[PDB]
Design a protein around this ligand. Structure first.
Ligand SMILES: *C/C=C(C)/C=C/C=C(C)/C=C/C1=C(C)CCCC1(C)C
Ligand SMILES: *C/C=C(C)/C=C/C=C(C)/C=C/C1=C(C)CCCC1(C)C
Ligand SMILES: *C/C=C(C)/C=C/C=C(C)/C=C/C1=C(C)CCCC1(C)C
Ligand SMILES: CCCCCCCCO[C@@H]1O[C@H](CO)[C@@H](O)[C@H](O)[C@H]1O
Ligand SMILES: CCCCCCCCO[C@@H]1O[C@H](CO)[C@@H](O)[C@H](O)[C@H]1O
Ligand SMILES: CCCCCCCCO[C@@H]1O[C@H](CO)[C@@H](O)[C@H](O)[C@H]1O
Ligand SMILES: [Cl-]
Ligand SMILES: [Cl-]
Ligand SMILES: [Cl-]
Lengths: 242, 242, 242
């Protein structure tokens, strides 16, 4: 009907990324066999962690381990209903987005003070997003947590468009950093946009299947494709980095 | 009566810090507009994270997300009763007290070996404190976990009064470190004192409202005021740090 | 009978490590009184954290805090039954095995890029192992999570047998690193072997008592004895390290 249909959107959006993460793992391992030790191999190891965390996350959601029903508060578009929350996505973003930040930070050769603060701000972003999805008592707190999460996000992007970009400029990865950083701000902006537009925020799109697929498509560009671009440039520019 | 009264203590002690953390965020952002890039801006970014974690924590407790009832074991002063545990406080101390340690560690220019161990010992302190509050099976374990937590605390203070202080002495922040470190050991000693004296330990003070307010007052000095002192000295001593 | 017997295996395997961890703490503190500041004292502090995390973990399992019943999926050897899962072991490995990696990384003087990736891969190993034990919906996911965990394990061992070993060779701890790294790969291989052979995997050994004792014996060599060897060599080689 539309529950046949809704359950077919959900499972396919999970199984596709279990597949592509696994392939990405296999491709990145293959690519590491051609990379010289040093700062190259160190970026490769951090990058390989991105799809390994990702496949664990989708196995988490698929196995039911990291999914639950959350009752939506009054004034929510779906007030009084139990929607299935893919809260495992927030959990695993917490370990996967620092992996990305570690790769970008190694590439740009950022200072470690900056690295810790960004990864800390990034873990803040992820966790308050989880609080936003888990909050049932009042609609106000759901968006309060959303706004606070955006504040951490703003700290993460600010450090990239300034401090880390400056560091890549004096590390000789200035150009490749520009591309990944353009790619990071555009795709990462998609997630709070999917949150607001979709079932958990405004619920202008009410399918849990659809918003799940939106996240899954974002995961394709922000994890696997992003990672693939990084490694390819690295295997082609091993002097500039080491 | 006294439940009117008890619920008025609890909500005010949460809402006050949601307010002051938010103001502190606004004030620290304002203050960052005058700070030169380098080690100054890096201390500022770490410091700004302190009240952003704090407002998320109080929103967590206020929204009911991170509060539960814990049945107290036999021999507890309130044996057989369900007290409301603000366990969200332990959770968030785990992410906020490393922020403080990061700021103090950047300021003193500590070695990274020391930084990791302290933050690890500090996360140990926080987590076993949570275990102490969550344990229901026996009073012995509650204080066992308490004592172990104090052992991590002792590791954290030892590194500050020696290794990090020595590092600040050869970093030229020797004096400002002295003040913050005096301020840190005094206020941080308050938390295990509030734990023992209040409802969760000995329960010589049995109000959950009151012990919550005690923590909230400690949070005012150990997060916002502490942070405000750091930033002010930094905006006045930007050569010494960079 | 055999539940008298089974509950006697479980409690003794927990209480023995609460005892030996506590003794180990006392012995390592004593040993730190003779260690010179610098890279020596920094390895000592990281090492002391190993048994302090360990005693908290066993107090967690003993107090019932971090133990639950998991219903085993169809096709499991114990399909349809509730076995007691010592999931607290996975939780605490997550904070204790980075402590070990920190000590080995300080000793070998590894690069910080390598340190973060290994500790990240190691936390991945631990967490997906927990997912493996917690998964109830299907036997496939339990071993899927197992295989993914082994992939992180493989990343951790690879970095040790190459990158960190190379770093110890140019740090002068080349020899002591060889011994600890031989000791680490052998003992760490025991844990996924106990997982597969014991109640949670294949259940060729079905006692929860017995598999718990297997883990406890592994904890004796991989935490306390390992740590004791490190400190002894350090107190005897303080020039080579500093
Ligand atoms: C690979 C996964 C990535 C890069 C995920 C990024 C996720 C975010 C940038 C999430 C952002 C959110 C906000 C900024 C507001 C609150 C809701 C969130 C958590 C979706
Ligand atoms: C901003 C929040 C801060 C600085 C919190 C500090 C918390 C502590 C120092 C907690 C200490 C505790 C012990 C030492 C014993 C067990 C109970 C605790 C967790 C309250
Ligand atoms: C002190 C505790 C230590 C060193 C524990 C190490 C644990 C492991 C190496 C666990 C390995 C596992 C796998 C590789 C597969 C999945 C099951 C685990 C988590 C037992
Ligand atoms: C991007 C942030 C804009 C939204 C900020 C908070 C909006 C208040 O909340 C929203 O109000 C609407 C009223 O029916 C509902 O449709 C939504 O489900 C609800 O989340
Ligand atoms: C600062 C640590 C001192 C206390 C150590 C453990 C004390 C044992 O426990 C205490 O015993 C009392 C007996 O009624 C009770 O009032 C307390 O509620 C209980 O926690
Ligand atoms: C080391 C990994 C080898 C096992 C891989 C997955 C094995 C499938 O699973 C196993 O099948 C058996 C059939 O009865 C059962 O005895 C086990 O309990 C079950 O876990
Ligand atoms: Cl993820
Ligand atoms: Cl906090
Ligand atoms: Cl452990």
């Amino acid at each position: 009907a539309a529950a046949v249909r809704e359950n077919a959107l959900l499972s396919s959006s999970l199984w596709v990324n279990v597949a592509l993460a696994g392939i990405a793992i296999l491709v990145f391992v293959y690519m590491g066999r051609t990379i010289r030790p040093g700062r190259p191999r160190l970026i490769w190891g951090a990058t390989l962690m991105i799809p390994l965390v990702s496949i664990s996350s989708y196995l988490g959601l698929l196995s039911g381990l990291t999914v639950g029903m959350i009752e939506m508060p009054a004034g929510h578009a779906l007030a009084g209903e139990m929607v299935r929350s893919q809260w495992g996505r927030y959990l695993t973003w917490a370990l996967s987005t620092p992996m990305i930040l570690l790769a970008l930070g190694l590439l740009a050769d950022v200072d470690l003070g900056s690295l810790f603060t960004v990864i800390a701000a990034d873990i803040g972003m992820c966790v308050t997003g989880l609080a936003a999805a888990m909050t049932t008592s009042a609609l106000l707190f759901r968006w309060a947590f959303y706004a606070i999460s955006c504040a951490f996000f703003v700290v993460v992007l600010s450090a990239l468009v300034t401090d880390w970009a400056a560091s890549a400029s004096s590390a000789g990865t200035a150009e490749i950093f520009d591309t990944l950083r353009v790619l990071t701000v555009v795709l990462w902006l998609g997630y709070p946009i999917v949150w607001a537009v979709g079932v958990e925020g405004l619920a202008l799109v009410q399918s849990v299947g659809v918003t799940s697929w939106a996240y899954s498509v974002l995961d394709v560009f922000a994890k696997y494709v992003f990672a693939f671009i990084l490694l390819r440039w690295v295997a082609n520019n091993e002097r500039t980095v080491a």
